[PDB]
Amino acid sequence: SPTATVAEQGEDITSKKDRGVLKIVKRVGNGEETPMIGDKVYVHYKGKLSNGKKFDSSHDRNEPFVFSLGKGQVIKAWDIGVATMKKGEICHLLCKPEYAYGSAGSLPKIPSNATLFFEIELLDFKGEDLFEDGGIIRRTKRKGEGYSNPNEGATVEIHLEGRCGGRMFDCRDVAFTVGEGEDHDIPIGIDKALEKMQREEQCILYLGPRYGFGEAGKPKFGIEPNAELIYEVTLKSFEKAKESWEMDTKEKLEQAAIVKEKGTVYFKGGKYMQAVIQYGKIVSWLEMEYGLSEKESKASESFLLAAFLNLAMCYLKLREYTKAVECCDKALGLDSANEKGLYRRGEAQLLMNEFESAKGDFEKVLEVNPQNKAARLQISMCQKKAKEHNERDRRIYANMFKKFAEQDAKEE
C-alpha cells in the first residue's frame, strides 16, 4: 500500500523531471533548515524491493546511519532526497535504478534494474568542522572545480560577505595574500578555510572566538571582543605560492629579507599570529639547505638564527610556552652560547613550572654574561616558586587522601 501511494501521489524532486525520485512526506518535522552539501547527516531507514521484501534496515536506535551529504557516499536518490528534508521529518522515496544501483544492481540483495522503496527519518545534521575544534564550521552552497587548493602565501580573488549577530558589516570583492588577510580587514579564519577550498566553490563559514577578530574586537565594523562571525565566501581564482624546493638560493635570500621586515612590522603592532606566519617562511626555506657558497651559508645561518629567536619571542607573547622552548632549542643548536636563546628558554620553562630546567638556563646565561641583572633575579624566582608549588601539592594530596579516606569510612 505505501509503495502504490508514492507511485500515485509522489512529488518529483529531479532536475531533468523524469519521475526518477518520487517523494511523499509522512511526518512534517521542524525548523525550515535543510541539510547542505558536505553536512554530517544522522538517519533511520528501511529498504524494500518491488515485491515488498525488506533488504536493509537501521531503525533499532542502537546506532543511526551517519554519512556526508552530496559526496556520493549514498545512492543518487538519497543525495537528492535527504537534501529536501527538515529536521525530525519522515518521508517515503520511490527510486528508479538510474538513481539507485542500475543494470548491475548489488547482487545478491539488489537485483538488476530495481525500483527501490525507502522510508527515511532525518534525526540530526551538522556542518563540517574543518579543524576538529569547533572553530570553523563549513556549509557548502556550490561545489568548486580543480586539482589544487590555495596554499599559505598564495594570492586569491574572493567575494566576501560578513555578518555579526545578523548585522552585515562587509560585502565586497577582495584580492589578498593567504596568511595576510589582516592587511585587508579579514580575520584569520578566512585564510585558514581558503586552504581547504577549490576554485569556483561557494560556502558559509561560522567563525568561533579563536578564528575571528579576537580580544581586541574590530571597532571600525562595530565588532565586540571575541564575537562570533558568519561569512559567505566565493573563491573566484588563485595563484599558488612557490614551494620551498621550487626556489633557488638567491631567491630564498632575497625573500628572507622581505618577510623578516614584514614580520617585524606585525610584531611592533602586536599582531603576533601574523608575525609567526612571516618568520616561519624563513625556517621553511632555509633549515634543510646545503651545498651553499661560504657567503650564502653565512647569510642563510644569520637569517635562520634570528628567525628562531624572533619566533620564541612571538610564542612567549602568545602564551605558547612549549613552542617557545622548541624555538630556543633550534637557536641553541646553531649557537650553543646564545644569550637570548638561553634566557627565553628559562622564561618559558619557568612559566610551565619546570623549575629545575629553568634554573639551569638562567645559570648558563650568567656563564655567558655575568653582567646580566635579570638572570640572577629569576634564579631566586625559580627557588621561591618551586617551594610554593611543593607546599601546594602537599596540601592537595593530604586533602584528597582525607576526602578519599572519609568517604571510604562512610561506605563501611
Numbering used by the authors: 13 to 424
Please, what does the article write about this entry?
FKBP51 is the co-chaperone to Hsp90 and belongs to the immunophilin family initially recognized for its involvement in regulation of steroid hormone receptor activity. Going from the N-terminus to C-terminus, the overall FKBP51 structure contains two mixed beta sheet wrapped around a central helix for FK1 and FK2 domains followed by the TPR domain consisting of three TPR repeats and one additional long helix in the C-terminus. FK1 domain is active as PPIase and known to bind to the FK506 and rapamycin inhibitors or modulators. Inside the cell, the TPR domain of FKBP51 mediates interaction with EEVD C-terminal sequence of Hsp90/Hsp70 molecular chaperones.
We solved the crystal structure of both the native form of FKBP51 and in complexation with the C90 peptide. The elongated shape of FKBP51 leads to non-uniform crystal packing and therefore anisotropic order and diffraction from our crystals. During x-ray data collection we noticed that the diffraction pattern was quite anisotropic and therefore, decided to truncate the data in an ellipsoidal fashion using diffraction anisotropy server for the complex and the Staraniso software for the native structure. For the native, we used reflections up to 1.88 Å in elliptical shape with 93% completeness (52% completeness with spherical truncation) while standard spherical truncation would have resulted in a 2.45 Å resolution being 100% complete. The native structure has R and Rfree values of 0.198 and 0.247, respectively at the resolution of 1.88 Å (52% spherical completeness) while the complex structure has the R and Rfree values of 0.192 and 0.262, respectively at 2.49 Å (62% spherical completeness). Using secondary-structure matching (SSM) server, we compared the RMSD between our two structures and previously reported structure and found that the RMSD between native and the complex structure was 0.48 Å and the RMSD between native and previously reported structure was 0.49 Å while the RMSD between the complex and reported structure was found to be 0.61 Å for 349 aligned residues. The two native structures are more similar as compared to the complex structure. The structure of native FKBP51 is already reported at a resolution of 2.7 Å33.
